[PDB]
Amino acid sequence: EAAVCTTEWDPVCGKDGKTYSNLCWLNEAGVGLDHEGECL
Ligand code: NA
Ligand code: NA
Ligand code: NA
Ligand code: NA
Secondary structure: OOOOOOOOOOOEEEOOOOEEOOHHHHHHHOOOEEEEOOOO
16 A cells, blocks of 8 residues: 655554554544544
């Protein structure tokens, strides 16, 4: 699959309980945003 997101770490927390490295990773995955920042 095309690699479309950068590795710039500005993490967000998906509703799936996984930390995504930045919003592009989250959005490309189709996962809803829980909150900004790392999941905890
Ligand atoms: Na493929
Ligand atoms: Na990179
Ligand atoms: Na999960
Ligand atoms: Na939330």
